[PDB]
């Protein structure tokens, strides 16, 4: 896939992703907060189309992500992120995609997710997150 | 004065300030680095004119500020920042302004200046700096 | 179980835990580094006995943990940490305990684990980790 790395910011305002209930996660794009101002991140897209878009608008600054979970699996011989779920202090968004494979989860007791980086080919190959106080 | 607060960034690329060798520091503006991209900060200007502009272009990323020093004094009955000096790991820029009053300095053993905030009326009233690893 | 919270330190030198290949993780104790000096953390013990002790001596400071993984499951009706694995930049220690239940893993691209907190009754109920640069 094509790697991407948004870097770190002040916070997260909105997340736009797409998925396919038979394959995995497709496109990924985030609208971060840069010192009180919305910052529109680059839209990282799948080499292919046919996904279902989803917009996750957070009630920034009072609402923030507390846990990120999902599943990684095999699709057409590639290991990818098949499902994703975002749990904030106000609501649970997801799961999105296919909930099959091996599960993973990142609960946060103290701190904030301030950035994303990963890779996307036909699907989201992998991803990492920037953490900060 | 009019307060300003740029917030925090990834680093500093260029600093643009103006001064008057009889009064104090006037305008202040910074070009920060935002995850590898130049970010042009807002130009905070003096209520008045007649200052001498100065551009401090740093050889980012290999060159960074190690110490900030200067003088605070009385001008027309107001306490302001009369002088400023920026010492990097490669060169010393300044002093700029009037070197009279009480001195102050911030040497940094480990860490980086990633943001500025302060206030400017006819002159730079005061300022603070964001520090990060 | 009885909660514990070691707090944060400079690093990790040695980890001492015990487990039972039929049940789950039992005792947990860490020898941290406090500014260049070994700091013997409190030994958090299980309400019961019959576990197999394991000592994980890291080659501090060149050797550090890069990933922590494990399994959480049901034992006598309680959800606990049944297995634990520590992967450093030099070796893999584990798995220890029973590798059954739902898996979890924490890979670290940049940063260090500098502290542990959790709870222990008959077994390790849950745990969290302190991260820093």
């Amino acid at each position: 896939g094509k790697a991407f790395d948004d870097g770190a910011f002040t916070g997260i305002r909105e997340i736009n992703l797409s998925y396919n209930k038979e394959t995995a996660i497709g496109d990924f794009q985030v609208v971060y907060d840069l010192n009180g101002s919305p910052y529109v991140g680059q839209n990282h897209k799948s080499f292919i189309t046919g996904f279902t878009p989803v917009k996750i608008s957070l009630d920034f600054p009072s609402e923030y992500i507390m846990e990120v979970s999902g599943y990684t699996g095999n699709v057409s011989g590639y290991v990818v992120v098949r499902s994703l779920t975002f749990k904030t202090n106000k609501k649970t968004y997801g799961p999105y995609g296919v909930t099959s494979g091996t599960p993973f989860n990142l609960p946060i007791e103290n701190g904030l997710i301030v950035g994303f980086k990963g890779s996307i080919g036909y699907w989201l190959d992998y991803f990492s997150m920037y953490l900060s106080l | 004065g009019k307060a300003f607060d740029d917030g925090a960034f990834t680093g500093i690329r260029e600093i643009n300030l103006s001064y008057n060798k009889e009064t104090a520091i006037g305008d202040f503006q910074v070009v920060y680095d935002l995850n590898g991209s130049p970010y042009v900060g807002q130009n905070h200007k003096s209520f008045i004119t007649g200052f001498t502009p100065v551009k401090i272009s740093l050889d980012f990323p290999s060159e960074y500020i190690m110490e900030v020093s200067g003088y605070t004094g009385n001008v027309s009955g107001y306490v302001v920042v009369r002088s400023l000096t920026f010492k990097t790991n490669k060169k010393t820029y300044g002093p700029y302004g009037v070197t009279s009053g009480t001195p102050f300095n911030l040497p940094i053993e480990n860490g980086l200046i990633v943001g500025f905030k302060g206030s400017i009326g006819y002159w730079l009233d005061y300022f603070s700096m964001y520090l990060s690893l | 179980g009885k909660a514990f919270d070691d707090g944060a330190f400079t690093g990790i030198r040695e980890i001492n835990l015990s487990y039972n290949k039929e049940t789950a993780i039992g005792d947990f104790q860490v020898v941290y580094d406090l500014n260049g000096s070994p700091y013997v953390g409190q030994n958090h013990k299980s309400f019961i006995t019959g576990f197999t002790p394991v000592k994980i001596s890291l080659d501090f400071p060149s050797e550090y943990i890069m990933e922590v993984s494990g399994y959480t499951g049901n034992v006598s009706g309680y959800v606990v940490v049944r297995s634990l694995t520590f992967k450093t930049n030099k070796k893999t220690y584990g798995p220890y305990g029973v590798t059954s239940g739902t898996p979890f893993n924490l890979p670290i691209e940049n940063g260090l684990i500098v502290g542990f907190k959790g709870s222990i009754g008959y077994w390790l109920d849950y745990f969290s980790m302190y991260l820093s640069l």
Partner: peptide, 15 residues
Amino acid sequence: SGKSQTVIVGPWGAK
């Protein structure tokens, strides 16, 4: 160097 750093956890997915 002159680039600010922050903690990063991951990756999850393809090795």
